[PDB]
Design a protein around this nucleic acid. Structure first.
Lengths: 343, 119, 428, 644, 119
RNA sequence: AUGGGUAUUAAUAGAGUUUUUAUCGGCAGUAUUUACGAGAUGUA
RNA sequence: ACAGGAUCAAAUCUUCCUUGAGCGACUCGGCAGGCAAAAAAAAAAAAAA
RNA sequence: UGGAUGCGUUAAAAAAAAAAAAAAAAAAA
């Protein structure tokens, strides 16, 4: 290796990383991160995401605690769980996966409803929202200490970025995580999620155990352990508004996407217009200078957040629709079939 | 004029390759090389010796003595202009900051515009 | 930048151009026009900035309001950047808008005031556009006709004012364009409604008209006579500039009766009034011409007035032309043949500094007058002779009618370039 | 220099004169020869320092669409407002996002903000406001040199504030790949850039060179300020850079390419002395290049451009020679020794003769525009006052013969009456042809008279007859403008066409005067030459007579009557400043138009030359004209005339 | 937009590897004689170069239809040009996103009990 | 010049251009960064 | 910055006053450079295409 | 065509020196 590479330390620095310095520097960093945002100067509404299943579970348990009875009970009372009991007192409520399914259903319904709402182009929604999947893999022969490294690598990344990350490491036991990621991506694509805007939002490690083997030594017998762990990953499909605000406004673009763009330009698989088309996302320098240009246009009030968002969304959707139509046409399908596919 | 207008000194006070009023003659070694090559080109083209100097790829320059005389006068005027402007700027710099650039005193790699290396 | 220009922070304004340059193409056209006006107001030349501003405004010029066009052109005039490419386009645009003719932006269609402002800009930049001046003359003649046609005394001067008339006449005088019809119409309007003309306007109009036109014409002579009567009447209200213009006009005129007595009385009144303006250290005027008029045809200036005028002449040296130098030296030489040694020394030093500005004849006559008005100090006399000598060689100039090296003892004793040591202190 | 700048700023007699706004032309620039620049190579080495750390595809800044005249609304809710906007405004509101044609169609279907006229559904809006046809063209920065010619042709076919970005990018890319482009492609690229830059151009009235014929509200003239001649179509740096390529590959240019190159250089008003001299030496009659290989149109264009450039080249050379005194260094010893002691033809003959032979041989296959421009350029001054210093009279005789043959064919040829602008342009061209004929005759006669010291009329008649009637017809058919002698309507196109008419009149008057001198020229042998010299220089002499014209006396009288008819009603303003003396001399020959001319002379006195002032003074004295203001101007201004 | 590099939509393409330094666009056109290209050779055949212009040995050839491109690949794959047989590849996607179907990665890599290879 | 229509030097709004070594082999893929203003009391 | 100011006004080449110390000094502001590759005892050594 | 070491050679002077890693009128980042 370089032998002069700068290796980072999160707790100490030559420049002075005492706690007061950390406070001041992180105040500066927070200020810069907040100022990096551009916000629309006119919106019609401030819709916020809510989870009906979670709200109903909360109210159900609050009623149980407040009245000592199930909602609707008039004679008997609530019976907490005891040792050996085979009945779940909260069996009527949905499970976590059921709540996730209901969330996906509600997201689909709201997406369909928004297509027939006036002024839908001037509504602020915020960070949270979209569909969520939770995928679990068990029997991984790795320990907490290594799994923490491999998951801290990928947390917060787009799914293809995470797959590229973990594939570059050439570690045999990371094949488990790679299999989980590949299977999750395939499942979401088959269910109809847009792989392009699926991110790894969080992870959870659950121990399962450790198999012990004797190790015979000079004066004692030891026990060497092989771990058994399970990993749960939370994938989230960002809504189109959040995707726009992330990629276009804050310039937080997947490196996999940027690499694909650069490879296309280098191989001349696209026209010369692609350079200006992809300028807002192509490279670090282009992203920085486009962010500067957008900031100046916003401060002169020539930039329009809602119009830019609409243009970005329309271009993305039209590209996807063209892909679908042309892949159908490549099969020799009839005009009636193609038309009916759009209903 | 009744109220004199003051020219801006920023062209003199801005030191970069994008400011000619300051980088026109910098570095002095390459300025000298440029002047020498201009003189050689003028002598080998506007004063032909009957042979191809081969200093550059050929050009279809005028050969009539009447045209050559006027070209020579133009080049002489350009030479005088460049020399006088360099002299004036050097005098102004000397009177202002006492800065003065002279000829190299010794045969050294830096005077040759090369890095000093083990070779 | 506009605030800094208004505050006179010339150095800071000059420094900020570095960051202004890469942002001109991003500003609004009215912002660029205000920037140009601000730079012109302090008389600071920044040719790179002005060129960039012109390139940026190229596609937007046609749609700019008349006031913003006037601001841009006034900035260029104040900076003395002779962008005739811009002046021609602005003149064509104004002519087209007037032909079509016949609150944050401002109207596209100009007014007589905007036309006169652009004409004054053209005079400052020495842009002699005869077509534009023909348009302006036609419009002004129509305006004068309509003003005379007006009858109820409340709509008079609705479209212009005596100051506007003065500005027009000054424009034509400065550009040396002899529009006889326009000048005669202006003089006729002045005669018709002179009771409404301020005395300063009367003085300026008389000066310009007498310098431009012959006084033998019947109408010109009559109007000039009446204007001189009114100006001699209003002398007590006039300032130094108006007094000097009146003195020049009263002598350049050709009256019917009492030609000499009129000039003598005018000069006497001007002398009486000058003493009352001793402390006026703000007004700008031609001290040299006033002194020359007072000392001419054997007339001898009053000692007090001469002292006051030579004292006040020091302020104007930074504004002097070669002709102003020559005229002041002539006046001093004539008056001696009183002497202002300090003024002569200052003139000699400044002409030695500005030797290159002078033609052979101008320099020769100036040196002759400097010597005749009481020779300056040798420190200026010797190098001045050397400069005259060099100029004569270079220009091969030798009139029909026509020393040593400097010594350390001739250097001023206020400085300490001699090795001598003196008793005393240097109070810091 | 600072001294010369101060001189100009102090001078109260020097001005930039223009009878009409279109007079002002870009300052003439002389482009010095090139030589190796290791210093500039060093600067480039510094400039390219950090390319590895940047973008491999768009290192250069993204173009900024021009901003609107007024600031947008504070809330910046254009989509909500729904009002359609310009293409540049749309791009800025979208944050410079590309809008291909199908996307524009979709967005126009949904929202009206994208339904502006500048947003063509079949083209798009582009990433920086590129509207209409330009939207489909990739940015020039990314285009390979082999495609630049087609790219520029497609861009020019389109014929809006965002077009300048594309054209500036094209200019920069052409300057960068000058050394990769084939020479012919480079010439065509320069021509395309010039055409775009000067599209909608109007020629200065007093200028001869013109790239293309004028034929191709009340008139067909539209005066656009953004495309006045004072706006140089090309940047000087591009021409300066291209000069080296042209000099290296000059022998590979075809006659049309050479004509186009000279035309572009003259249009931009930039001259390279070496390139012009090389072009003059390359071409000669029967110099491995035949002037006969030119077509008449290309030949006329080439000659006109060459003359236009060479005249100003000579003027600048003279002025710089006069300036060199103060750059030279003189010593005090030489200064003291000084008092110890005290006690205009710029065409090489081998090219002028070839041009004259070409004109003589092919006069019958010319157009009015081409032949008149070529003849007027070839004539120019001809050293008529002073008279290799001068060309051989054989070439001038051949030019006169060419003029005669062209007039003979052209009289039989039929004319087309179009818009008043084209008609006035043609009238001016005919007047200039007459001027060229008169100058040829005067030069030939002066040479013969000088020989004696040492020891065509039909064509002129035809031209005079045509001019004297066309002038009156155009004056009658042209709207009436107000007179110098709640705004008043004065249309600029009408003013320009009136200036064209008056320029034609002045050219005809000058031709008439020169014909009078040439005819007067034939002890007496030297007396005639002295008389001609005195008449031309403004010294005292006997009053000129119409009888000298002979067969052209009636035509001169009819021309004078037509000019009087025009000047009586149109006024004197609009006359060219270079022919007031000629008009006064014609009036003196023929003896309210006289009063108009005198008033215009008085108004323009500050701009007139000393020679013109002397000639006007003596013409007035012979005519017994007693204008009280012209008298004042003659006797109290211009010491150079007052003292003599 | 006539140039292929300018078109927003590219015709069917093929990629050629194995080209010697001598190879030219005309040589590639002769190699593809009998097959319909998307245009004249100067546009249909594009040799790939580095920043200094040195050949990379890789070329892109455009055809009028995918059928013709695949026929040309079938006929000319591993055929000779200047003494070296050339390899040809399709160089355009199907739109089906087959990359989403990644193979199952081994969970039993017993490195120390398997034969040596350079996988 | 009873004096400034007056004498001299506008490159003026444009002083603008890519050197040398070198038969052949090799690197150059990315990220960060400048409006922490209340454009605005918008051009009078 | 000779940038602003005063005066019966300065040797060419400012008689003074102001500029808290003209930002510590000199520069830059499309400046600045963490990682990879390729090299590499500290360092130094490749302009871009 | 070279590398390391001493069994080889040189110095034994400077300490307000050689040198360094935090320009600081910035008093609630």
């Amino acid at each position: 290796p370089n032998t002069k590479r700068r290796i980072r330390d999160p707790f100490w620095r030559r420049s002075g990383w005492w706690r007061w310095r950390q406070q001041e520097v992180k105040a500066m960093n927070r200020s810069r991160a907040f100022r990096r945002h551009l916000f629309p100067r006119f919106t019609t509404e401030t819709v916020s995401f809510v989870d009906a299943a979670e709200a109903e579970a909360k109210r159900f348990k609050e009623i149980v605690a407040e009245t000592g009875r199930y909602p609707g009970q008039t004679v008997n009372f609530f019976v907490p769980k005891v040792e050996g009991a085979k009945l779940d007192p909260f069996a009527a409520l949905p499970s976590r996966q059921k709540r996730l399914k209901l969330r996906r259903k509600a997201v689909r319904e709201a997406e369909e409803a928004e297509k027939a709402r006036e002024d839908a182009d001037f509504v602020w929604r915020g960070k949270g929202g979209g569909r969520v999947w939770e995928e679990r893999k068990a029997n991984i022969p790795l320990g907490k200490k290594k799994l923490l490294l491999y998951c801290t690598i990928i947390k917060g990344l787009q799914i293809t970025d995470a797959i590229d990350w973990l594939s570059s490491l050439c570690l045999h036991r990371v094949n488990y995580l790679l299999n989980l990621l590949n299977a999750s991506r395939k499942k979401i694509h088959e269910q109809g999620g847009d792989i392009s805007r699926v991110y790894v939002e969080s992870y959870m490690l659950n121990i399962q155990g450790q198999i012990k083997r004797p190790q015979f030594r000079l004066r004692m017998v030891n026990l060497i352990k092989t771990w058994k762990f399970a990993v749960v990953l939370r994938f989230r499909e960002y809504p189109m508004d959040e995707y726009f605000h992330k990629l276009f406004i804050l310039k937080h673009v997947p490196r996999s996407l940027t690499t694909d763009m650069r490879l296309a330009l280098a191989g001349q698989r696209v026209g010369l217009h692609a350079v200006r088309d992809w300028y807002p996302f192509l490279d670090s320098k282009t992203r920085f200078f486009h962010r500067k240009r957008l900031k100046w246009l916003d401060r002169t009030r020539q930039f329009d957040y809602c119009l830019a968002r609409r243009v970005f969304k329309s271009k993305y959707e039209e590209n996807c629709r063209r892909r679908k139509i042309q892949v159908l046409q490549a099969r020799g399908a009839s005009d009636a079939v193609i038309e009916e596919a759009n209903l | 004029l009744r109220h004199r207008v003051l020219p801006s000194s920023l062209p003199n006070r801005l030191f970069s390759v994008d400011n000619r009023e300051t980088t026109r003659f910098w570095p002095p070694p390459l300025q000298k090389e440029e002047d020498e090559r201009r003189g050689a080109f003028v002598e080998s083209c506007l004063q032909p010796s009957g042979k191809a100097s081969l200093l550059q790829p050929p050009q279809c320059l005028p050969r009539a003595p009447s045209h050559l005389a006027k070209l020579m006068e133009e080049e002489e005027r350009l030479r005088l202009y460049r020399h006088l402007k360099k002299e004036e700027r050097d005098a102004a710099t000397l009177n202002k900051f006492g800065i003065w650039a002279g000829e190299p005193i010794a045969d050294t790699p830096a005077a040759k515009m090369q890095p000093l290396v083990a070779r | 930048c506009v605030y800094l220009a208004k505050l006179n922070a010339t150095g800071d304004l000059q420094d900020l151009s570095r960051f202004l340059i890469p942002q001109v193409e991003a500003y609004f056209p009215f912002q660029l026009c205000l920037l140009a006006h601000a730079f012109g107001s302090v008389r600071l030349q920044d040719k790179v900035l002005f060129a960039a501003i012109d390139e940026a405004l190229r596609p937007h010029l046609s749609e700019l309001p008349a006031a913003m066009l006037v601001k841009l052109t006034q900035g260029y005039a104040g900076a003395l950047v002779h962008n005739y490419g811009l002046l021609a386009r602005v003149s064509l645009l104004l002519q087209q808008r007037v032909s079509r003719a016949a609150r944050h932006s401002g109207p596209l269609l100009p007014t007589l005031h905007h036309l006169l402002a652009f004409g004054r800009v053209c005079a400052d930049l020495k842009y002699q556009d005869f077509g534009y001046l023909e348009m302006l003359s036609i419009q002004m003649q129509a305006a004068f006709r309509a003003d005379l046609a007006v009858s109820s005394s409340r709509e008079t001067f609705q479209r212009f004012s005596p100051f506007s008339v003065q500005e027009l006449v000054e424009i034509f005088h400065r550009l040396k364009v002899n529009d006889v019809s326009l000048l005669l119409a202006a003089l006729r309007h002045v005669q018709a409604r002179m009771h409404d003309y301020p005395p300063s306007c009367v003085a300026s109009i008389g000066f310009c008209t007498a310098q431009m036109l012959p006084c033998d014409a019947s109408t010109v002579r009559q109007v000039h006579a009446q204007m001189l009567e009114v100006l001699q009447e209003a002398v007590p209200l006039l300032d130094l500039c108006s007094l000097g213009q009146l003195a020049a006009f009263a002598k350049k005129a050709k009256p019917r009766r009492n030609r000499s007595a009129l000039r003598s009385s005018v000069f006497e009144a001007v002398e009486a009034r000058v003493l009352e303006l001793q402390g006026d250290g703000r007004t700008v005027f031609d001290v040299g011409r006033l002194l020359e008029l007072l000392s001419l045809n054997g007339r001898r200036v009053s000692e007090e007035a001469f002292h006051i005028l030579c004292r006040q002449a020091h302020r104007h040296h930074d504004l002097f032309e070669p002709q102003d130098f020559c005229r002041l030296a002539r006046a001093l030489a004539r008056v001696k043949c009183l002497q202002a040694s300090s003024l002569v020394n200052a003139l000699a030093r400044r002409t030695l500094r500005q030797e290159d500005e002078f033609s052979p004849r101008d320099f020769l006559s100036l040196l002759r007058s400097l010597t005749l008005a009481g020779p300056p100090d040798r420190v200026y006399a010797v190098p001045l002779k050397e400069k005259l000598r060099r100029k004569q060689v270079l220009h091969n100039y030798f009139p029909a009618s026509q020393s040593e090296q400097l010594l350390e003892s001739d250097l001023p004793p206020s400085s300490r370039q001699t090795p001598t040591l003196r008793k005393g202190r240097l109070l810091l | 220099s600072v001294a010369s700048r101060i001189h100009f700023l102090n001078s109260r007699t020097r001005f930039q004169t223009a009878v009409h706004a279109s007079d002002v032309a870009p300052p003439f620039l002389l482009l010095p020869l090139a030589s190796p620049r290791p210093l500039l190579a060093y600067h480039h080495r510094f400039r390219t320092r950090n390319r590895k750390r940047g973008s491999r595809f768009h290192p250069h800044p993204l173009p900024l669409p021009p901003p609107p005249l007024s600031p947008p609304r504070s809330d910046a809710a254009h989509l909500f407002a729904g009002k359609p906007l310009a293409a540049s405004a749309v791009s800025t509101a979208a944050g410079q996002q590309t809008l291909p044609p199908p996307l524009l169609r979709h967005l126009q279907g949904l929202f009206p903000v994208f339904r502006g006229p500048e947003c063509d559904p079949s083209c798009g809006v582009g990433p920086a406001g590129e509207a209409a046809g330009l939207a489909l063209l990739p940015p020039p920065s990314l285009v390979e040199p082999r495609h630049l010619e087609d790219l520029a042709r497609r861009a020019l076919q389109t014929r809006c504030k965002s077009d300048r970005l594309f054209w500036r990018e094209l200019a920069a890319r052409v300057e960068k790949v000058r050394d990769l482009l084939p020479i012919e492609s480079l010439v065509r690229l320069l021509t395309i850039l010039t055409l775009n830059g000067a599209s909608g151009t109007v020629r200065p009235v007093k200028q001869i060179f013109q790239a293309f014929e004028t034929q191709d509200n009340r008139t067909g003239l539209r005066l656009a300020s953004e495309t006045l001649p004072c706006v140089r179509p090309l940047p000087p740096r591009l021409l300066l850079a291209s000069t080296r390529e042209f000099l290296e590959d000059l022998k590979k240019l075809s006659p049309p390419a050479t004509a186009a190159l000279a035309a572009t250089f003259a249009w931009s008003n930039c001259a390279s002395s070496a390139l012009l001299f090389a072009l003059m030496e390359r071409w000669a009659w029967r110099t491995q290049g035949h002037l006969g290989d030119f077509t008449p149109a290309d030949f006329a264009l080439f000659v006109s451009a060459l003359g236009h450039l060479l005249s100003q080249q000579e003027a600048t050379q003279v002025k710089y020679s006069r300036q060199a005194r103060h750059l030279r260094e003189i010593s005090g010893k030489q200064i003291m020794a000084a008092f110890r002691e005290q006690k205009a033809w710029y065409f090489t003959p081998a090219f002028f003769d070839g041009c004259c032979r070409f004109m003589e041989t092919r006069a019958e296959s010319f157009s009015l525009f081409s032949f008149a421009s070529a003849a007027r350029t070839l004539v120019e001054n001809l050293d008529t006052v002073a008279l290799v210093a001068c060309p051989t009279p054989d070439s001038v005789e051949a030019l006169a013969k060419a003029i005669s043959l062209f007039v003979a064919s052209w009289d039989g040829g039929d004319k087309t009456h179009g818009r008043l602008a084209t008609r006035a342009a043609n009238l001016l061209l005919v007047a200039r042809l007459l001027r060229a004929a008169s100058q040829c005759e005067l030069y030939i006669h002066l040479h013969r008279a000088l020989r004696l010291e040492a020891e065509t009329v039909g064509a002129c008649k035809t031209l005079l007859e045509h001019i004297s009637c066309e002038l009156g017809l155009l004056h009658s058919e042209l709207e009436a403008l107000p007179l110098l002698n709640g705004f008043v309507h004065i249309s600029p196109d009408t003013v320009y066409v009136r200036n064209e008419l008056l320029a034609a009149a002045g050219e005809s008057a000058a031709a008439v005067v020169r014909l009078h001198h040439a005819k007067s020229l034939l002890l007496s042998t030297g007396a005639r030459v002295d008389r001609v010299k005195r008449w031309m220089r403004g010294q005292q002499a006997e009053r000129m007579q119409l009888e000298m014209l002979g067969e052209l006396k009636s035509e001169a009288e009819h021309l004078a009557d037509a000019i009087d008819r025009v000047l009586r009603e149109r006024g004197a303003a609009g006359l060219p400043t270079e022919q007031l003396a000629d008009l006064m001399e014609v009036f003196a020959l023929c003896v309210s138009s006289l009063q108009a001319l005198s008033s215009e002379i008085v108004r323009r006195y500050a701009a007139l030359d000393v020679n013109q002032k002397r000639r006007i003074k003596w013409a007035t004295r012979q005519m017994d004209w007693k204008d009280p203001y012209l008298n004042h101007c003659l006797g109290h201004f211009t010491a150079a005339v007052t003292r003599q | 937009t006539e140039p292929i590099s300018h078109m927003q939509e590219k015709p069917a393409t093929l990629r050629l590897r194995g080209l010697p330094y001598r190879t030219t666009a005309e040589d590639i056109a002769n190699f593809f004689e009998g097959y319909s290209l998307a245009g004249p050779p100067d546009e249909a055949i594009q040799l790939h170069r580095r920043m200094d212009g040195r050949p990379t040995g890789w070329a892109s050839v455009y055809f009028e239809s995918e059928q013709e491109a695949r026929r040309a690949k079938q006929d000319k794959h591993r055929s000779y040009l200047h003494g070296r047989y050339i390899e040809i590849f399709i160089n355009f996607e199907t739109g089906e996103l087959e990359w989403i179907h990644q193979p199952q990665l081994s969970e039993n890599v017993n490195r120390k009990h398997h034969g040596k290879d350079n996988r």
